[PDB]
Design a protein around this motif. Sequence first.
Motif, PDB file in Angstrom:
ATOM      1  N   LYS A   1       0.822  -1.204   0.000  1.00 41.76           N
ATOM      2  CA  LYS A   1       0.000   0.000   0.000  1.00 41.76           C
ATOM      3  C   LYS A   1       0.858   1.257   0.000  1.00 41.76           C
ATOM      4  O   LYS A   1       1.831   1.364   0.745  1.00 41.76           O
ATOM      5  CB  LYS A   1      -0.936   0.021   1.206  1.00 41.76           C
ATOM      6  N   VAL A   2       0.473   2.222  -0.832  1.00 40.67           N
ATOM      7  CA  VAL A   2       1.081   3.549  -0.854  1.00 40.67           C
ATOM      8  C   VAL A   2      -0.044   4.558  -0.744  1.00 40.67           C
ATOM      9  O   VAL A   2      -1.165   4.299  -1.184  1.00 40.67           O
ATOM     10  CB  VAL A   2       1.923   3.805  -2.126  1.00 40.67           C
ATOM     11  N   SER A   3       0.247   5.708  -0.133  1.00 41.73           N
ATOM     12  CA  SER A   3      -0.816   6.657   0.151  1.00 41.73           C
ATOM     13  C   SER A   3      -0.306   8.078   0.032  1.00 41.73           C
ATOM     14  O   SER A   3       0.868   8.361   0.276  1.00 41.73           O
ATOM     15  CB  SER A   3      -1.398   6.465   1.558  1.00 41.73           C
ATOM     16  N   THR A   4      -1.214   8.969  -0.337  1.00 42.97           N
ATOM     17  CA  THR A   4      -0.965  10.399  -0.276  1.00 42.97           C
ATOM     18  C   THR A   4      -2.249  11.075   0.175  1.00 42.97           C
ATOM     19  O   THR A   4      -3.332  10.761  -0.328  1.00 42.97           O
ATOM     20  CB  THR A   4      -0.468  10.948  -1.631  1.00 42.97           C
ATOM     21  N   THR A   5      -2.136  11.976   1.141  1.00 40.83           N
ATOM     22  CA  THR A   5      -3.288  12.702   1.656  1.00 40.83           C
ATOM     23  C   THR A   5      -3.208  14.143   1.188  1.00 40.83           C
ATOM     24  O   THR A   5      -2.137  14.760   1.229  1.00 40.83           O
ATOM     25  CB  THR A   5      -3.358  12.627   3.181  1.00 40.83           C
ATOM     26  N   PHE A   6      -4.340  14.666   0.734  1.00 35.30           N
ATOM     27  CA  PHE A   6      -4.398  16.013   0.193  1.00 35.30           C
ATOM     28  C   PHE A   6      -5.763  16.592   0.510  1.00 35.30           C
ATOM     29  O   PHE A   6      -6.753  15.862   0.647  1.00 35.30           O
ATOM     30  CB  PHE A   6      -4.177  16.040  -1.327  1.00 35.30           C
ATOM     31  N   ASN A   7      -5.820  17.911   0.616  1.00 35.62           N
ATOM     32  CA  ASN A   7      -7.100  18.566   0.797  1.00 35.62           C
ATOM     33  C   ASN A   7      -7.721  18.879  -0.559  1.00 35.62           C
ATOM     34  O   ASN A   7      -7.051  19.402  -1.456  1.00 35.62           O
ATOM     35  CB  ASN A   7      -6.959  19.827   1.648  1.00 35.62           C
ATOM     36  N   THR A   8      -8.998  18.529  -0.707  1.00 34.98           N
ATOM     37  CA  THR A   8      -9.678  18.691  -1.988  1.00 34.98           C
ATOM     38  C   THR A   8      -9.934  20.148  -2.337  1.00 34.98           C
ATOM     39  O   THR A   8     -10.098  20.466  -3.515  1.00 34.98           O
ATOM     40  CB  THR A   8     -11.026  17.979  -1.983  1.00 34.98           C
ATOM     41  N   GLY A   9     -10.022  21.028  -1.341  1.00 33.50           N
ATOM     42  CA  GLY A   9     -10.430  22.391  -1.632  1.00 33.50           C
ATOM     43  C   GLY A   9     -11.748  22.389  -2.383  1.00 33.50           C
ATOM     44  O   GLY A   9     -12.705  21.708  -1.990  1.00 33.50           O
ATOM     45  N   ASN A  10     -11.797  23.114  -3.507  1.00 30.25           N
ATOM     46  CA  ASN A  10     -12.978  23.157  -4.355  1.00 30.25           C
ATOM     47  C   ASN A  10     -13.006  22.054  -5.399  1.00 30.25           C
ATOM     48  O   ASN A  10     -13.857  22.088  -6.298  1.00 30.25           O
ATOM     49  CB  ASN A  10     -13.088  24.521  -5.055  1.00 30.25           C
ATOM     50  N   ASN A  11     -12.117  21.066  -5.290  1.00 26.19           N
ATOM     51  CA  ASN A  11     -12.003  20.008  -6.294  1.00 26.19           C
ATOM     52  C   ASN A  11     -12.801  18.781  -5.861  1.00 26.19           C
ATOM     53  O   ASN A  11     -12.285  17.823  -5.294  1.00 26.19           O
ATOM     54  CB  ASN A  11     -10.540  19.676  -6.547  1.00 26.19           C
ATOM     55  N   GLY A  12     -14.090  18.811  -6.169  1.00 26.91           N
ATOM     56  CA  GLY A  12     -14.918  17.643  -5.949  1.00 26.91           C
ATOM     57  C   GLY A  12     -14.637  16.538  -6.935  1.00 26.91           C
ATOM     58  O   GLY A  12     -14.951  15.381  -6.663  1.00 26.91           O
ATOM     59  N   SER A  13     -14.045  16.876  -8.073  1.00 30.11           N
ATOM     60  CA  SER A  13     -13.638  15.918  -9.085  1.00 30.11           C
ATOM     61  C   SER A  13     -12.151  16.106  -9.316  1.00 30.11           C
ATOM     62  O   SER A  13     -11.679  17.241  -9.424  1.00 30.11           O
ATOM     63  CB  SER A  13     -14.412  16.116 -10.387  1.00 30.11           C
ATOM     64  N   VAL A  14     -11.407  14.999  -9.329  1.00 31.95           N
ATOM     65  CA  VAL A  14      -9.962  15.049  -9.499  1.00 31.95           C
ATOM     66  C   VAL A  14      -9.568  13.964 -10.481  1.00 31.95           C
ATOM     67  O   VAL A  14     -10.292  12.994 -10.677  1.00 31.95           O
ATOM     68  CB  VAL A  14      -9.196  14.860  -8.172  1.00 31.95           C
ATOM     69  N   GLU A  15      -8.395  14.133 -11.095  1.00 34.59           N
ATOM     70  CA  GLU A  15      -7.785  13.099 -11.926  1.00 34.59           C
ATOM     71  C   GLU A  15      -6.714  12.412 -11.077  1.00 34.59           C
ATOM     72  O   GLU A  15      -5.698  13.026 -10.720  1.00 34.59           O
ATOM     73  CB  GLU A  15      -7.180  13.689 -13.199  1.00 34.59           C
ATOM     74  N   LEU A  16      -6.954  11.149 -10.738  1.00 31.19           N
ATOM     75  CA  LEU A  16      -5.967  10.338 -10.051  1.00 31.19           C
ATOM     76  C   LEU A  16      -5.004   9.806 -11.084  1.00 31.19           C
ATOM     77  O   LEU A  16      -5.409   9.400 -12.170  1.00 31.19           O
ATOM     78  CB  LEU A  16      -6.614   9.170  -9.304  1.00 31.19           C
ATOM     79  N   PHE A  17      -3.728   9.838 -10.766  1.00 26.03           N
ATOM     80  CA  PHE A  17      -2.782   9.203 -11.662  1.00 26.03           C
ATOM     81  C   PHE A  17      -1.858   8.286 -10.887  1.00 26.03           C
ATOM     82  O   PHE A  17      -1.592   8.486  -9.697  1.00 26.03           O
ATOM     83  CB  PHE A  17      -1.982  10.242 -12.472  1.00 26.03           C
ATOM     84  N   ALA A  18      -1.376   7.267 -11.586  1.00 29.25           N
ATOM     85  CA  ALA A  18      -0.390   6.353 -11.033  1.00 29.25           C
ATOM     86  C   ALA A  18       0.482   5.950 -12.213  1.00 29.25           C
ATOM     87  O   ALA A  18       0.053   5.167 -13.065  1.00 29.25           O
ATOM     88  CB  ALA A  18      -1.043   5.156 -10.354  1.00 29.25           C
ATOM     89  N   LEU A  19       1.667   6.542 -12.275  1.00 31.49           N
ATOM     90  CA  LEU A  19       2.568   6.433 -13.414  1.00 31.49           C
ATOM     91  C   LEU A  19       3.904   5.898 -12.934  1.00 31.49           C
ATOM     92  O   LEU A  19       4.222   5.965 -11.740  1.00 31.49           O
ATOM     93  CB  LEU A  19       2.774   7.790 -14.102  1.00 31.49           C
TER      94      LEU A  19
END
Length: 197
Positions: A141-159
């Motif tokens: 498992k790998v994780s990153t925590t971030f605050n969404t702010g006004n971003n109810g929709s985000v592009e998740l990437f894993a490259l």
Amino acid sequence: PTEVTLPVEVHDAQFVDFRANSGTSDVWVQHEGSSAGFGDVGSSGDNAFGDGGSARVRFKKDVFNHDFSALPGVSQVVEGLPFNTDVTYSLYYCDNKKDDSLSTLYFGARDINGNAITEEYAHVKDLSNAPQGTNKTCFKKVSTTFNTGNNGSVELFALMAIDVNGTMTEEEIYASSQFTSNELEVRLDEFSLTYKG
């Protein structure tokens, strides 16, 4: 009040449909261009917890026009994140190429304009004690925590980034067993988004 951990749905988060449809997906976007040198993305039967398959990211050992600075992998536009909330984006990451691995996972979230909300790197050398899959335990498992702010929709990437902190030459990579045997490959499974409510 009592704190609870709540999900935001990631579609085909276990690559069940991705595997069944041999890499074709309307939710997973492949970052690839195998015969043009930009890496290969496809499905693998390996998985973290026994469900579906996994996204296998590689530079094919039988292809000799690679740009090893390419960032192959997957992304997905995910809706329904809560506003103004610390969201934890996780996936399970299987790199079998040991502490010497030339692969680094580059994962994070971008907003609707393509700006980075969060960016994170993970290398298997640092994951020996991470939570693991019950089926293929190489998935960590790998994780990153971030605050969404006004971003109810985000592009998740894993490259996948190759030799992200070094200066090996193209020829040195081509001559490596990690390429000739393992196609510099990694596998991705089991994406999640959680937050506290």
